[PDB]
Amino acid sequence: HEGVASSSIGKPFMGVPASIVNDESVVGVRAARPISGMQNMIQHLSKLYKRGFSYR
Amino acid sequence: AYIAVPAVVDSRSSEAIGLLESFGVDAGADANDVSYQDHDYVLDQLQYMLDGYEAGDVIDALVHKNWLHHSVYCLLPPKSQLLEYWKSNPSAIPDNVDRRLRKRLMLKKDLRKDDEYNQLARAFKISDVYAPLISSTTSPMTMIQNLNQGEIVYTTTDRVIGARILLYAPRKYYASTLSFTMTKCIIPVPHSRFNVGTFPSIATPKCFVMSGVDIESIPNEFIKLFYQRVKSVHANILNDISPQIVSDMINRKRLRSHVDVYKVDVVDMLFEVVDVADGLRNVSRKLTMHTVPVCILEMLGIEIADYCIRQEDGMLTDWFLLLTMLSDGLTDRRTHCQYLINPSSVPPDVILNISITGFINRHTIDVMPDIYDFVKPIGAVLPKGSFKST
Amino acid sequence: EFISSWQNHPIVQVSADVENKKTAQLLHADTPRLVTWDAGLCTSFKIVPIVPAQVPQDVLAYTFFTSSYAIQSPFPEAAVSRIVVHTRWASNVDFDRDSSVIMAPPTENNIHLFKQLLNTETLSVRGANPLMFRANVLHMLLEFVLDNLYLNRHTGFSQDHTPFTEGANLRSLPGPDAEKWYSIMYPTRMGTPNVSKICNFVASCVRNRVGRFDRAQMMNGAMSEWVDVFETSDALTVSIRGRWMARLARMNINPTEIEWALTECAQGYVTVTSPYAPSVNRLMPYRISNAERQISQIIRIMNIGNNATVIQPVLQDISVLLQRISPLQIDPTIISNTMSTVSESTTQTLSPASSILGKLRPSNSDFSSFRVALAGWLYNGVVTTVIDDSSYPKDGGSVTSLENLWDFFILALALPLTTDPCAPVKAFMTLANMMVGFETIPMDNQIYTQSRRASAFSTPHTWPRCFMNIQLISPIDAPILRQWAEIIHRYWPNPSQIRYGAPNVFGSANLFTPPEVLLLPIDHQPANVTTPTLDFTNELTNWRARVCELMKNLVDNQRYQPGWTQSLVSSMRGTLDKLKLIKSMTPMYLQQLAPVELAVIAPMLPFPPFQVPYVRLDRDRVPTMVGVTRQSRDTITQPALSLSTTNTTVGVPLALDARAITVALLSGKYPPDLVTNVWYADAIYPMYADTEVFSNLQRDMITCEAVQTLVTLVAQISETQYPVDRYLDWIPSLRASAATAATFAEWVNTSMKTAFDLSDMLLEPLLSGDPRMTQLAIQYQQYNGRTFNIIPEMPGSVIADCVQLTAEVFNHEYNLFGIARGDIIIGRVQSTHLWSPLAPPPDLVFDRDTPGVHIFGRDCRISFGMNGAAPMIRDETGLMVPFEGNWIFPLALWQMNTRYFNQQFDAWIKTGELRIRIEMGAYPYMLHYYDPRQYANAWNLTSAWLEEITPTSIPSVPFMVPISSDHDISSAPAVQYIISTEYNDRSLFCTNSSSPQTIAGPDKHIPVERYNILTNPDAPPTQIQLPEVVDLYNVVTRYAYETPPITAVVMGVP
Amino acid sequence: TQSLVSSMRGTLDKLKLIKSMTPMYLQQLAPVELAVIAPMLPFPPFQVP
Amino acid sequence: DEADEATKKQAKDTDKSKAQVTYSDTGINNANELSRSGNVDNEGGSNQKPMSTRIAEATSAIVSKHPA
Amino acid sequence: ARAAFLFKTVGFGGLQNVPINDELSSHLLRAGNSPWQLTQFLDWISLGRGLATSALVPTAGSRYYQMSCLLSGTLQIPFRPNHRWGDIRFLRLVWSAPTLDGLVVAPPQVLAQPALQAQADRVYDCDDYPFLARDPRFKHRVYQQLSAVTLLNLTGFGPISYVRVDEDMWSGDVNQLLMNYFGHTFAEIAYTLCQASANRPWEYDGTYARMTQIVLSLFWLSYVGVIHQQNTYRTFYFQCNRRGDAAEVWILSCSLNHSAQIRPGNRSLFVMPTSPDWNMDVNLILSSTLTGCLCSGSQLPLIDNNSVPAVSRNIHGWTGRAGNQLHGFQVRRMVTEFCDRLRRDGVMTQAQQNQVEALADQTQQFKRDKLETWAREDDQYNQAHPNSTMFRTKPFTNAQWGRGNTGATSAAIAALI
């Protein structure tokens, strides 16, 4: 997610559009950072990777 | 007088709900003085624009928009489709069109192999007939300027921002997406003294931006970005007014359905730790506790005063513990760091007497966790020694 | 088991982590908030009641006092009143600095104000370490100034309709309530019915200095430009805001200058207009100095050091801008069309056209590399553009290979566009590596021989002697190599220069070049027509022709031709002719149009260009080092003597692809019918509506201000090389070190960031070194050893000057800030007299020169008594003395031997005849008021203080003071134990203000000197008495200036 | 293949100008600590010049 | 705003969607124009608070009451 | 255009060394180590809205004189024939870098070595110094403040200002630029002009130079009283609501009532105050500073030798055998001249004149008392300390408190129009 930046700023991929999310890693201030197509896609994949999988 | 607030505003919903009252504005008695703009379509247009361009330039361009002046976009079909649409119902051709093209278009005959109509067809350009054209390459700043000056802005693309888009030809000729939210039918409002909108602007010096809500705590993320960029770029040329000032402006001379249940108003509380061991007082520390709902505050009566937060046995009181649990944490006001309360009476850093000072940040949030999508059991992870029994 | 120590886990307030948002900062930076308006009172001191009045009473009837009639009064009506410091206790601001300094009345504890910075080891909550008082006070004064940095606003007036004044104009305050303000603001308006102290003071004043007395009405039906009023305020904040306003006024500019600057920057392609009529005094502060620009540029260069990833996105952005505004575009099929007509035979195994097409592989994205190569011309100081190693042949190649010939052709065309100074040598060594074995030349050593890769010749030291001296190459043995060397020497492009920008408003950030000048590695010839056609009179076209003819000569050489079929020779010659005569517009575009676009783009770049001179083939002048400095060496004080050896090199190489550059150079076309003036007027117009440069100017100003403030503050607690005056040397302080300086600097940085509402980095580039010896300078060096260095001049700092002025005022008004001065005396005094312990009678005080005193110091020893003898302690003279008399103690002795000294001395202090003078210098104090008609003792308080003294902190010194009375009272005994060595009672304002007089106790009337304007009839209305006395009634100037955006006044023709 | 002169010089300059207190501690305080703790050791010091 | 209203009234009078003659958006940079407004009183101050209320404030600041 | 760059240093006011010491030098360099302190002085005077004061700097003229003394005492190091810049010290101070960028504390060796003994009334040529000769922009930037110092140090009275009237100066660009300062004050205009001149040296006959000359002429004509609301110079004048006040404020203004008739030609002269109370008049010092900034590339006319002391005669670029006369005046008498001219013009009444006279008398009394007290304190300090003697204000004599050539100066300025 951090490596894909720079070369993809503000431009979509795979038909997934770019977006805008929150940042609070920096101490004391928590602002909004814009993410790219891959960044948004990784952001959505991350919650699945953190919660797990359901299997019928 | 245009006033910008950090929330989405709609003509009917924001009128039904007490948006200004939610932010803390005093009542205005008759509501004929205020009128609300609608910016939800502007917000989804902003998302569509962000899909193509960068956030910064679009935001900077949208800053220079005058919301007190009306204008609309007129979407045109592609060149060929415009030619067939003019071939049909030939009353649609404007006077600016070439005489030879107009006469040939009235041919009412199959013009594929005439080749004079065809060489004219290669010769034709839409910009010749229509001067203001976005042409899908125009900068957002130029879009906003052409929207500010004039009433009808012609375009050949749907990726625009700032105003409603009206079709010029029947839908058959248009092969674009069915974005009916911004695109209306092919065939076809005064402002009050105060107009409330979302996006701040710097077009005219009668615009105002409402303070009182910290830019950190803005719930809506797109509005957070817009406010951040505007404040970071044009900090020195923005008019900031307190909610008290807004209420005074509203009531200077006069003063002398289904409702959602998952929306609550929260406030930030300011207090100070005081040692009253002797008859004298000693102020030890300044703390701010975040995101306290107002309804519990009204229930458990809290005013600006002095309280003791320990019982005779030596443990924290139930009301204080409940308030701390409900809040989202405590921050030291001098050193901007998270503060952790000592539960015991061991001499280092014991809080026994507190003094409430005031409340500053007031806004509306949604208590929906947003992951509770299906009704399922709940499993919460909490470390040891967390007053579980209490 | 009651460990009480695990709870003592410290939390670090400053964290350090790897930093990648330096790119974000360099691309865009937060703008400081400079313009803030205040509509309240311009005061920072308030009067509070300490002891309530004595109404009703058994002597005077209640119908005397005005409080009985509920008459509002300017001053509190109480028995005791004191002045307390409270910044912005009466104000209405639109933006909040959040640097407030609030104090409590002296009857409360204020110890928390002096334990903010380095008291992380003080366990107690009521004590502080006396060795950081100076640092805490300095931080407090900085907070004072930062909080008081505001501007005054003119609200509005109304005429008085009562006979209390002679129809004066009174100001109206915006707020929920105004009755209290209307009585606080104008003391003289009150009537005087009786003979109380307040009424006497009011009656002793003039009647014609109240409200507004001067205005600037420049137009009809519009707000006055400014007004001057008499109202309650204080001289310190008045002066601070005056200096702030003067600083902004020196930055103000007018729309005509903006119009001229924009036109000159746009080079005549964009026109803007300004009004011509009377106006309303706008305030648009945007002009700063070249020194500030240079300092900010140096700081940015320091931030971007040796790290490519921090600078590459800047070049990407510049390439995007060039692509957006440029008319040149790729031609899709020019090369294929021109190569589809070369005559060939179908029975050959080699096809030059197929081979060259396969090696070229044109693509549209190839133009991005070309544009970033163009962008790299503006930053050769820190970024060096090179050709990537993968472009060279894997093993050096051979001239018998057509593929290797095409690689040589591509590299030869691509190389002269890079900023790498070793490009000619690399170009020569490419052909040398290919022709090894076929032809030989004499090299220098056995390491950098003729077989070494051409990309390894990257330093000026590696240039072969045969390259510099052509006579060494044999005309017979290496004719092709000699020809190539001669072509390189007599056809490499010649650098030139162009002019850019409008430094009238924007200033100049150039460092090693004359201002307003850009250098270019190729020759620039301005175009003379607006309708261009194809032209071959260009240096790049000549270069291509020479390369093609050289390859023709190589093919026609009689030692090479016999190895080829005739058909292949003919096809190769035809291909070379077609490549020579191809119709590309890129070489002409690069000569006539690209410099203009670069010049119009440069002035609005977030990172201003940083350049060093281009040298063509002069090896002695090749730059080899660029360095910046931020510290100093052992005792070297002058930067010109330590820059040479206290600098860190900067610079980084960035690689590009030769194939993309060659394709861009070979395939370029203009729109079918292009008119340059119209095209550029259309393209440039949207770009010139931004104000980010105007914001960056303010950012640079704030940066320089912060640097100077930092050095000025550090000089107060450490030893530095800059001249500075001292005013707080009587306040105790520790022996500082590098860690102490770093912590103090971090606190100052955080405070200023909070004050000016900044979230990004500031002073952290300079916080990575010892801040006790800071300096700023830059230099670069040539091959021959000459060095050129730049030492920017330091501009002043209004904030630092204001802080120093505040220190000067504090040096006389320390009492108002809760601090006492001098030493203390402990001993038993029993009497019925009503003198105050803060102003003791002289006879009680003794000092080092008083006969009979005993001075103690480092070497103290106590010998116990035996068989009725008395214990003794050793004096510094060497005699042993009993536990009686007058002693003089430094604080550290008792601090280091607390428990033993308490146990051995408390009884003799309480009951015996021992009196001890503790030397402290400065300390916070506490007051306890007692009724004078009853018994009172202070032993409990004194013993508590003595017993809670600890080797790392002390609590506030307690004093016991009587209460003033306005009628006869009886007397009762009182026991005192602690007194001060000097007068420390300047905080009093008045006693029994509602009563005609004070019969008993301390007496103090209203200070007339603090109201010199109202009480001295023949004094100028605008006289101040700083720093000795702070006045509480002054003349205030209030403005109504407008702050519109740039686009609201300057409008460009569409 | 690529020149690293500037990078090497920058790294070396940073290492040279690092703000370490270790030499000061070694030349000022460590001898004092060693002299303080030496006479109390069970095994007294045994040194060669 | 007055210029815009005049332009709209002219368009309505001429019975056209847009007006040939416009009092707004001309080619002239008339940015220093001023017009009478209710925000500024006769004394040159602001009217964020009415003059009558200001007078009431000032006169109420000096009231005295009957003793008990 | 100026061709010779020469400047004169301050002279001892009866002492045996430059009247400055370590305390004053540190107080001056308190917030910045650059000896060129024009911007710092501008910030300190705070737009002239009130009476600035301090413990070591009683008045604005005090700071101006101290800046002059510091520059005079410090510049003598690199101007020695050996031209070395950083081998000797002056009052525990040494130059940093050959380009004269700042002053720092001396190294331990230089501190042990003896300091430099400065001299009085030295005249130096900028082109002698190699670095100043090499760099034209640096020389032009420095020469503005050098010229201001020279204009202050040329005589024993207050600073000198230049007034010029010429109709051909006005042009379209000048009108456009001048119209933008409709409501600003003289101090603000001077601030902006000085900052612009610092950013870029002006050329011989540039728009900024012409506008500066026009502004100076307008201010001096309004000060004398020839130009007012009912008699304007091309509908421009300066208004002062409280004449005779301690801190006067002058505002540019336009009026369409009447325009005076101006004879064609080019005329000019040189003005200066003589009474010591000029130390508390920001406008006069700012006018002198503007003239100094102009002197960078304009080559003003020569000053007659007979109007300056012997040590200031025959300066190559400033004084000459036959030159213009210096006209000196007294502020209190000039106030009366102003009132009388207005009354004769018929726009003022006797009661108003009496009020102005009373206010002026009060102001003069106050300033005289303060100046005498400060002079006595300085004398006592010099008596107490014999090794660090100093002066906080330019010395004056009792005779300078009387009216001089005020009538002749007023007549000449009136005849200028």
For C583-624, the three-class secondary structure string (H helix, E strand, C coil) is: CCCHHHHHHHCHHHHHHHHHHHCCCCCCCCCCCCCCHHHCEE
Q: Give the integer Cα–Cα distance in Å for F354 and C1019.
A: 19
Q: Give the integer Cα–Cα distance in Å for F217 and C812.
A: 46
| Collapsed DSSP state (helix, strand, coil) of residue C46 | strand
Compute CA distances C690 → B124, C512, C773, whole Å.
36, 28, 39
What count of other Cβ atoms lies within 10 Å of the Cβ of residue B318? Answer: 11
Per the listing, tokens 């009238």 go with C504
Per the listing, tokens 């309480």 go with C910
- In this structure, what token pair is assigned to residue C751? 């405070």
- Host H or E run for residue B243: helix B243-250
- Which residue, B61, B361, B22, is CA-closest to B196? B22
Q: Kindly state whether C998 is in contact with chain D, defined as any CB-CB distance less than 8 angstroms.
A: no
Cβ contact, residue pair A6, C759, below 8 Å: no
Is the CB of residue F26 less than 8 Å from the CB of residue C724?
Answer: yes
For chain E, the first-to-last Cα distance in angstroms comes to: 59
Q: Kindly state whether A34 is in contact with chain B, defined as any CB-CB distance less than 8 angstroms.
A: yes
Instruction: Kindly give the residue spans of alpha helices, DSSP state H, lying in B64-166.
Output: 79-87, 99-105, 116-123, 126-129, 140-148
- In this structure, what token pair is assigned to residue C788? 């050129």
Instruction: Kindly give the residue spans of alpha helices, DSSP state H, lying in C361-512.
Output: 366-375, 402-414, 423-435, 465-468, 479-491, 503-506
Q: Kindly state whether A52 is in contact with chain B, defined as any CB-CB distance less than 8 angstroms.
A: no
Cβ contact, residue pair E34, C1053, below 8 Å: no
Q: Sort strands B194-197 and B2-4 into parallel, antiparallel or unpaired.
A: parallel
Residue C281 region by backbone torsions, left for phi larger than 0, else alpha for psi between -120 and 50, else beta: left
Q: Mention every residue, 6+ apart, whose C-beta is less than 8 A from residue C997.
A: C197, C966
What per-residue string of b and e applies to C51-78 under the rule 16 or more CB within 10 Å gives b?
A: bebbeeeeeeeeebbbebeebbbbbbbb
Is the CB of residue C135 less than 8 Å from the CB of residue C112?
Answer: no
- Which residue, C518, C586, C523, C506, is CA-closest to C380? C518
Q: Give the integer Cα–Cα distance in Å for C881 and C889.
A: 15
How far is residue C752 CA from its own chain's centroid? 8
Cβ contact, residue pair C312, A6, below 8 Å: yes
| Collapsed DSSP state (helix, strand, coil) of residue C1021 | coil
Is the CB of residue C249 less than 8 Å from the CB of residue F45?
Answer: no
- In this structure, what token pair is assigned to residue B302? 């809290």
- In this structure, what token pair is assigned to residue F226? 């020839």
Q: Give the integer Cα–Cα distance in Å for C537 and C524.
A: 13
Is the CB of residue F250 less than 8 Å from the CB of residue F186?
Answer: yes
- In this structure, what token pair is assigned to residue B47? 């998302």
- C/D interface, count of CB pairs below 8 Å: 51
Closest approach of chain B CAs to the CA of C290, in angstroms? 23
Which letter does DSSP use for residue C775 in this model?
A: -
Of how many residues is chain C composed?
1054
When CB atoms are compared, the residue of A2, A6, A27 closest to C15 is: A27
Q: Is the dihedral of CA C322, C323, C325, C327 positive or negative?
A: positive
Please name the method used to determine this structure: cryo-EM
Backbone angles phi and psi of B183, in degrees to 5: -105, 125
Per the listing, tokens 């007290």 go with F373
Is the CB of residue C1010 less than 8 Å from the CB of residue C976?
Answer: no
Compute CA distances C234 → C41, C144, C237, F261, whole Å.
9, 14, 6, 50
Q: Mention every residue, 6+ apart, whose C-beta is less than 8 A from residue C946.
A: C826, C902, C906
Q: Give the integer Cα–Cα distance in Å for F350 and C51.
A: 56
Is the CB of residue A32 less than 8 Å from the CB of residue B221?
Answer: yes
DSSP line for C326-361: ---B--SSHHHHHHTT----TT-S--HHHHHHHHH-
Q: Give the integer Cα–Cα distance in Å for C36 and E54.
A: 25
Cβ contact, residue pair F34, C794, below 8 Å: yes
> Are F and C neighbours with ≥3 CB pairs closer than 8 A?
yes
Of how many residues is chain D composed?
49
Cβ contact, residue pair C4, B282, below 8 Å: no
Of how many residues is chain A composed?
56
Alpha-carbon Rg of chain B, whole angstroms? 30
Q: Give the integer Cα–Cα distance in Å for C252 and C240.
A: 19
Q: Mention every residue, 6+ apart, whose C-beta is less than 8 A from residue B164.
A: B41, B72, B73, B182, B184
Which residue type sits at B255? L
Which letter does DSSP use for residue C817 in this model?
A: G
Q: Is the dihedral of CA B376, B377, B383, B387 positive or negative?
A: positive
Compute CA distances C1017 → C348, C1021, F14, F354, F356, whole Å.
115, 10, 38, 19, 17
Of how many residues is chain E composed?
68
Is the CB of residue B111 less than 8 Å from the CB of residue B207?
Answer: no
| Collapsed DSSP state (helix, strand, coil) of residue F6 | strand
Closest approach of chain B CAs to the CA of C124, in angstroms? 8
In C216-369, beta strands by DSSP E: 226-232, 272-273
- Chain B residues whose beta carbon lies within 8 Å of the beta carbon of residue A50: none
- Which residue, F219, F220, F210, is CA-closest to F412? F220
C-alpha angle F187/F193/F194, rounded to 5°? Answer: 85
Q: Kindly state whether D10 is in contact with chain C, defined as any CB-CB distance less than 8 angstroms.
A: yes
- Host H or E run for residue B283: strand B282-293
- Which residue, C142, C136, C282, is CA-closest to C705? C142
| Collapsed DSSP state (helix, strand, coil) of residue C888 | strand
| Collapsed DSSP state (helix, strand, coil) of residue B359 | strand
| Collapsed DSSP state (helix, strand, coil) of residue C546 | helix
Q: Sort strands C37-38 and C151-152 into parallel, antiparallel or unpaired.
A: parallel
Which residue type sits at F193? L
C-alpha angle C804/C805/C811, rounded to 5°? Answer: 90
When CB atoms are compared, the residue of A29, A30, A32 closest to B225 is: A32
Chain B residue closest in CA terms to E31: B204
Helix crossing, F350-384 with F331-345: angle to 10°? 170
When CB atoms are compared, the residue of B53, B216, B221 closest to A20 is: B221
Q: Mention every residue, 6+ apart, whose C-beta is less than 8 A from residue C605.
A: C318, C378
What count of other Cβ atoms lies within 10 Å of the Cβ of residue C363? Answer: 12
- In this structure, what token pair is assigned to residue C360? 């070229």
| Collapsed DSSP state (helix, strand, coil) of residue F289 | helix
Per the listing, tokens 């503005």 go with F144
Q: Give the integer Cα–Cα distance in Å for F224 and F334.
A: 7
- In this structure, what token pair is assigned to residue C655? 């690689």
Is the CB of residue C459 less than 8 Å from the CB of residue D3?
Answer: yes
Q: Kindly state whether E9 is in contact with chain B, defined as any CB-CB distance less than 8 angstroms.
A: no
- Which residue, C357, C434, C358, C413, is CA-closest to C545? C413
Compute CA distances D21 → C769, D24, D29, whole Å.
12, 5, 11
What count of other Cβ atoms lies within 10 Å of the Cβ of residue C836? Answer: 20
Cβ contact, residue pair C655, D10, below 8 Å: no
What per-residue string of b and e applies to C796-823 under the rule 16 or more CB within 10 Å gives b?
A: bbbbbbbbbbbbbbbbbbbbbbbbbbbb
Which letter does DSSP use for residue C460 in this model?
A: G
What count of other Cβ atoms lies within 10 Å of the Cβ of residue E46? Answer: 18
Per the listing, tokens 């006001």 go with B333
Cβ contact, residue pair D17, C655, below 8 Å: no
Q: Mention every residue, 6+ apart, whose C-beta is less than 8 A from residue C747.
A: C117, C139
Per the listing, tokens 């850093």 go with B349
Which residue type sits at F67? M
Which letter does DSSP use for residue B248 in this model?
A: H
Peptide bond into C327 cis (omega under 30): no
Residue F37 region by backbone torsions, left for phi larger than 0, else alpha for psi between -120 and 50, else beta: alpha
- Which residue, F238, F202, F218, is CA-closest to F165? F218
Q: Mention every residue, 6+ apart, whose C-beta is less than 8 A from residue E49.
A: B252, C156, C172, C174
B58, HSE (Cβ side, Cα atoms, 13 Å): 22
User: Beta partners for C230?
Assistant: C211, C1035
Which residue type sits at B317? T
Is the CB of residue C571 less than 8 Å from the CB of residue C555?
Answer: no
When CB atoms are compared, the residue of B53, B216, B337 closest to A30 is: B216
- Which residue, C944, C938, C942, is CA-closest to C960? C938
Per the listing, tokens 């908030």 go with C33
Compute CA distances C555 → C338, C485, C574, E19, F389, whole Å.
21, 18, 12, 75, 90
Neighbours of chain D (3+ CB pairs under 8 A): C
Helix crossing, C133-148 with C738-756: angle to 10°? 20
Per the listing, tokens 């839908």 go with B171
What count of other Cβ atoms lies within 10 Å of the Cβ of residue C437? Answer: 10
Q: Mention every residue, 6+ apart, whose C-beta is less than 8 A from residue C559.
A: none
Q: Mention every residue, 6+ apart, whose C-beta is less than 8 A from residue C553.
A: C480, C483
Residue F146 region by backbone torsions, left for phi larger than 0, else alpha for psi between -120 and 50, else beta: alpha
Q: Mention every residue, 6+ apart, whose C-beta is less than 8 A from residue C818.
A: C85, C103, C106, C110, C113, C924, C925
Q: Give the integer Cα–Cα distance in Å for B210 and B239.
A: 8
- Which residue, C928, C603, C614, C805, is CA-closest to C142? C805
In degrees to the nearest 10, what's the CA dihedral of C377, C378, C379, C385? -10
| Collapsed DSSP state (helix, strand, coil) of residue C704 | helix
Q: Which of residues 761-800 of C touch D (CB under 8 A)?
A: 768-770
